[PDB]
């Protein structure tokens, strides 16, 4: 099946610093990864799709990277409003191979 | 090669000697396998796929399942017993097969021999599904490098993903569905119900390549085939492929390409005769005689040239296309010109002269023959069928509006003076042949009733 | 099904019993109409059209006008009188038609029956011109939803409008003109002067779909056709279309798709014989006999298989392709083996064994027959034509390099010991057939003159 | 045109008179040259070409070299002597040519006549290499404006250069290589070893245009050809091209398009007969007779219609396709109905009525004939073969489900009462024809041995 190993579960970083989140897929997903932002008591907010493309209206300090099995999410120039739980998800659909899963999440 | 066809008498009845070609037949095939993915990778444009890919998968499964079952009929009933000195091959379950031709059974044996490398290739099944390029090379231990061709993958990568920004998602989805449907429409002619016996290595690689849009050049060059007779093998339908595995879950197939080498058939040539209309009894005629004669070990036989590739140097065939010849035709080619039939010429356009060994053979009654050297016309009497024009008669002849210089004829010095016996007239039209047969039955029956 | 072909004697002369297939013929067509727009909508790229669209309109009108006139010949001369109990159909003006075949008149009747839904569709003419998508669905009152396919519209939308920014207007105009000209070059083979009788429902949907780039899969799936025999109906040329309206002002046409269902012909089967070379008089021979025999109500007739689709289970045809058989051929298939002719085998490659009901029928003089069970060779004397190999003689036979296990033969226990009478030899080559006919006329004439 | 076929008796044996068409044959060709560049200009995307262009150049040289050598065989051996009053043409070296047909020598003459404009065009060789558009026009002194078509140039300009930003360089290189390989796969069928004699103007322009993707419409409209019979000339294979120059260094060729005009053959027509099954001896039959008869100067001959284009008005052919007819067939068409053979009808579907001059000719035993005017059925006795239905018998006839009004028959008033003599039965199947021939040899031999 498809699973997503997202590290780390939680992380601390000062305002103005950079934080790195990583997502690992059990199978190759060919750059078909998304990144979401979720604040407590709120619906998720789309951040990045296709591992690199930034969603409209999302600050450029959120930077996604990766291909295949390994992907990273980097948040530079950290702000107070950035504190939230961050998830990744695979929407891989070659046509014959189905890979869909959510990351465990990073606080 | 020598002469056993009595070409002089044949020339007098309008059959001019043509080019002598070699006889080459395919043999010793070189086997290479290749994977063909019938479903493109749409991961980079998955948002606009909709349900198109599911419908396409259903249709492609409907197409592919009969091929898999036909192959399984032999795969399930072919057993590889533990090898030893008593048996050197595998056994075919004749009762289980039930009814099969010799070629089909040999193709089943070939399918078994393919099964080994087919199993080796299928170890990379997860990698095959992950491929997103039109042509890709798979390496894992530098052993039997697997090549994978994917259908429509180049269209997905160069025409739909680049324009995904520019056009709406529904437009992109419709374009994808149209591409898949056109691929199915073109692929159906080869892989549909027309493909009755998938257990056969007789299908040409050009037909096999329809799964890859008919780009057999890419398929062949990817596997690394290279030979001087690449084009000669291709055009003579000698390069063939065989489906050796079908995956209904992943929608890909493995084909085994049979690449042979041309071998010159020793002590064999193929002589061609150029038909020319000759005049007899104030009428024009054409000898109804094999234009291509196969001679092998000085044995005259007919040949089914239509299935062969004719080049200037040789005749290339994917099998022996020799056919028997009746004794009367062989006696006429032997030199009994009264045995070759002829047919009336009523068409305004028919070959009325030819050129062999620098010597002309012209119907100077139908055409206007003039001698450019002497400046006087070349006339042909009614008693003679053809006219031989050479250096003794005319150094530079003029046939219509062509001016050709001639050589010297090497036959009888009195060719135009000797003459020969004309054969019988015939009618080659189909309904005419039926009419002739029926009138013959009536004449024979009247004679028998008189008896 | 039963046996009426005397298969044992036939097997002795090299005709091995093959698969028995059903007889299926199309019938009961399901009619659906669809609009095909032969001119794409270029409104979104009108600046780079230039005069290309006008030239294309002129050329397409030149192509389309003869079709419209041919249809009008029947449309103008077909009158629908006020229906009542005295007449139940429409009348055809025979004097006005002048000369017509039966099929052409029936097609004119079908054109009339189409005219109703054709008029309903043409109410949406303004909407048809406004369509800018390759496939579009038209709804107005949920009555007879009209589908419209537009040629080259997908190319306009996905390849020219997206790149209009990237390339010059002259480049885009040239590309558009090239696309239209290629469409005309490919469409001309089907809709040009080759289409002599547009008043006919005999043209296959694959040919009809050339107006839509040959994507007949999209055309058929859009109308919603679905059946288990979709591929069988397609490949057997049973799904046909008929042009029922041509608009020269708007450059679109309406075609009526005839989608039939296959019906099993009761009390009828089609038996196949597998030819195998047999030895006689130190020579190899092949029986010149119908490889496919049609039996219906225990009546043997020939069949024109070439126009039918052969599957493993049945023979699918778009009409009855039965043909008569001469009484001598029927008597040989009946069991008079001296009535079937034979032909000399000179080719190095010809089927020399076959497998039926787990039993082998091999020319063990031409091929090397060995018994894997006993370890000794299987020899065939000169007096016997073929060799029957089964479980009594050899449990596991080896033919060349194939090892096949066998069943038990159910015929005469002394098959290899009985023998049969060989027929006469023949020559099937075309020029050879003419030569044989002519020599026959000469022999018959000599006999008559002696009488 | 007149009547010489005795159509009444023919109608009684199921041959209904059809349409009378003219006879048109091509002549007087108009010659225009055009350059075809087989290699696209990739200068604007040179970074992603890699080694693809070198491999393509090598392969294309391998393909093109034989054509150049074949043309050089005639070019090197054709000499233009200083013109004067003694000679008005060029001389062909017969000894150097060796063996050649008449058509090949005439094609060599045409190649010479092309060489002048070919040399004029080749003066612009540097400009030809620099062209980067699919269609380009070359002017230098307003003399013989040279047109240049470039293969795949539209794909380079509209699909690869615009997407060079969007996809990787390796992706673009693979797409380019795939395009070139597909072009080679499609071009090989026409320009590969299948093209044996490049010294010939007999190849159709549609085949020639495969070097330009088969867009012969662009090729023809660029040169400026325009005629009412454009489509008629195209579909009848009358517009032909000839390769007159091959450049192996620049990978382009020059072809000479032969554009003829159709000429009506005076005092000649082509009559068609509509076959209809007629009943005799409680059986159905079809006359085995030429469905198309050529009459020219009141001389009946067969015609090879298959190579001609049939339109409603005339028969268009690229040469004279007349063939002789046996005297028995000509006597039957003359009016001796016992000379035309017939064949048993066993198929469920065969034409059983036809319509000529508003008069019906129906097998009212097989079909149900009813008179809509009188309301009573139309019955046909067993003694009569066909039924003539016209205004005297039935003003409005009903054949199956078609209702057709009729005219008045102009033949004998007692057509249905006179009757005629039926011919002999035949069997047209191939193996059946061989069987009949063989049984005839056996009967004739038994009779000779009795003598
Ligand atoms: C050739 O003519 C003979 C005439 O006797 C045909 O022979 C028989 O034809 C009659 C005609 O009705 C049949 O009833 C018989 O069954 C036939 N056979 C025998 C043994 O008498 C013969 O069929 C004709 N063949 C061809 C090919 O035209
Ligand atoms: C079979 O041979 C006979 C020989 O008598 C041919 O019959 C006639 O042939 C002569 C030859 O010039 C013609 O002049 C006559 O017009 C023919 N018919 C009659 C009634 O005498 C016959 O044509 C030959 N048929 C075939 C098919 O070879
Ligand atoms: C028609 O039958 C005759 C029977 O005499 C065949 O004639 C000869 O056939 C024998 C049979 O072995 C040969 O040995 C001879 O060489 C043949 N020719 C001569 C001159 O005797 C004849 O071949 C048969 N033809 C057809 C077309 O069936
Ligand atoms: C898929 O998309 C990613 C990100 O846009 C890109 O890096 C990759 O090259 C694309 N692959 C294909 C086969 O188009
Ligand atoms: C062949 O064997 C496999 C596995 O036993 C089975 O799934 C398949 O249905 C068999 N096919 C046939 C035609 O017997
Ligand atoms: C005729 O041709 C022969 C063959 O090449 C040659 O040897 C001879 O000299 C020629 N005679 C002439 C041209 O007078
Ligand atoms: C035509 O252009 C408009 C505006 O650019 C766009 O909204 C529309 O989708 C386009 N239609 C097609 C068929 O391309
Ligand atoms: C058919 O009738 C229409 C309208 O009367 C007319 O325009 C057209 O020319 C007619 N066609 C023929 C072939 O008579
Ligand atoms: C031979 O084949 C028959 C048919 O299946 C079988 O019943 C019999 O047992 C076989 N005999 C052997 C293999 O000895
Ligand atoms: C080549 O590129 C130049 C600069 O980008 C452009 O001006 C020119 O039109 C292009 N030519 C072709 C044939 O694409
Ligand atoms: C033709 O002549 C040219 C120049 O003399 C030469 O390069 C070429 O090889 C010749 N070709 C043949 C077939 O003789
Ligand atoms: C029968 O047809 C002829 C031919 O047009 C016509 O002159 C005659 O009036 C018709 N007679 C009828 C319909 O009674």
UniProtKB/Swiss-Prot annotation, chains B, C, D:
Residue span of region Fusion peptide: 87-111
Species of origin: Nipah virus
Location(s) in or outside the cell: Virion membrane; Host cell membrane
Residues under site feature: Cleavage: 86-87
Functional summary from the UniProt entry: Class I viral fusion protein. Under the current model, the protein has at least 3 conformational states: pre-fusion native state, pre-hairpin intermediate state, and post-fusion hairpin state. During viral and plasma cell membrane fusion, the heptad repeat (HR) regions assume a trimer-of-hairpins structure, positioning the fusion peptide in close proximity to the C-terminal region of the ectodomain. The formation of this structure appears to drive apposition and subsequent fusion of viral and plasma cell membranes.
Superkingdom in the source lineage: Viruses
Protein name stated in the entry: Fusion glycoprotein F0
Stretches of the chain found on the membrane's Extracellular side: 4-451
GO biological process terms on file: fusion of virus membrane with host plasma membrane; membrane fusion involved in viral entry into host cell; symbiont entry into host cell
Keyword Glycoprotein: yes
Keywords: Coiled coil, Disulfide bond, Fusion of virus membrane with host cell membrane, Fusion of virus membrane with host membrane, Glycoprotein, Host cell membrane, Host membrane, Membrane, Signal, Transmembrane, Transmembrane helix, Viral envelope protein, Viral penetration into host cytoplasm, Virion, Virus entry into host cell
Known glycosylation sites: 41, 44, 76, 391, 441
Encoding gene, per UniProt annotation: F
Assembly description: Homotrimer; disulfide-linked F1-F2. Interacts with the Glycoprotein G; this interaction involves both head and stalk regions of glygoprotein G. In pre-fusion state, found as a dimer of trimer.
Membrane topology: Single-pass type I membrane protein; Single-pass membrane protein
């Amino acid at each position: 099946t498809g699973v997503m190993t997202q590290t780390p579960a939680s992380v601390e970083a000062a305002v103005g610093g950079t934080v790195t989140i990583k997502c690992q897929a059990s199978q190759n997903i060919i750059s078909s990864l998304a990144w979401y932002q979720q604040k407590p008591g709120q619906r998720p907010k789309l951040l990045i799709y296709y591992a690199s493309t930034l969603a409209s209206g999302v600050p450029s300090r959120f930077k996604g990277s990766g291909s295949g099995t390994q992907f990273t999410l980097t948040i530079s120039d950290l702000e107070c409003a950035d504190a939230a739980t961050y998830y990744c998800q695979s929407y891989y659909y070659s046509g014959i191979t189905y890979g869909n899963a959510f990351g465990g999440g990073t606080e | 090669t020598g002469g056993i066809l009595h070409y002089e008498k044949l020339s007098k009845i309008g059959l001019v000697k043509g080019v002598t070609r070699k006889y080459k037949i395919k043999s010793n095939p070189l086997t290479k396998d290749i994977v063909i993915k019938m479903i493109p990778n749409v991961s980079n444009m998955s948002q606009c796929t909709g349900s198109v890919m599911e419908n396409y998968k259903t249709r492609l499964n409907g197409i592919l399942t009969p091929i898999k079952g036909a192959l399984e009929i032999y795969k399930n009933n072919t057993h590889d017993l533990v090898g030893d000195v008593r048996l050197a091959g595998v056994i075919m379950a004749g009762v289980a097969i039930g009814i099969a031709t010799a070629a089909q059974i040999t193709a089943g044996v070939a399918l078994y021999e393919a099964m080994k490398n087919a199993d080796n290739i299928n170890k990379l099944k997860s990698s095959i599904e992950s491929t997103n390029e039109a042509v890709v090379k798979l390496q894992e231990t530098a052993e039997k490098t697997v090549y994978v061709l994917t259908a429509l993958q180049d269209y997905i990568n160069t025409n739909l993903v680049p324009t995904i920004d520019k056009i709406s998602c529904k437009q992109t989805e419709l374009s994808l569905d149209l591409a898949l449907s056109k691929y199915l429409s073109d692929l159906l002619f080869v892989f549909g119900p027309n493909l009755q016996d998938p257990v056969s290595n007789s299908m040409t690689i050009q037909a096999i390549s329809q799964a890859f849009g008919g780009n057999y050049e890419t398929l062949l060059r990817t596997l690394g085939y290279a030979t001087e007779d690449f084009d000669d093998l291709l055009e003579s339908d000698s390069i063939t492929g065989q489906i050796i595995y079908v995956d209904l879950s992943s929608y890909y197939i493995i084909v085994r390409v049979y690449f042979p080498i041309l071998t010159e058939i020793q002590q064999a040539y193929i002589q061609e005769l150029l038909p020319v209309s000759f005049n007899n009894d104030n009428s024009e005629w054409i000898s109804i005689v094999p234009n291509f004669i196969l001679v092998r070990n000085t044995l005259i036989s007919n040949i089914e040239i239509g299935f062969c590739l004719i080049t200037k140097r040789s005749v290339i065939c994917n099998q022996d296309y020799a056919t028997p010849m009746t004794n009367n035709m062989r006696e006429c080619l032997t030199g009994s010109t009264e045995k070759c039939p002829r047919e009336l010429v009523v068409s305004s356009h028919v070959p009325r002269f030819a050129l062999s060994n620098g010597v002309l053979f012209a119907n100077c009654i139908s055409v206007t023959c003039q001698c450019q050297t002497t400046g006087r016309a070349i006339s042909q009497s009614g008693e003679q069928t053809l006219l031989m024009i050479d250096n003794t008669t005319c150094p530079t002849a003029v046939l219509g509006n062509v001016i050709i210089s001639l050589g010297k004829y090497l036959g009888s010095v009195n060719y135009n003076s000797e003459g020969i016996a004309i054969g019988p007239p015939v009618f080659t039209d189909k309904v005419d042949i039926s009419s002739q047969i029926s009138s013959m039955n009536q004449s024979l029956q009247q004679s028998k009733d008189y008896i």
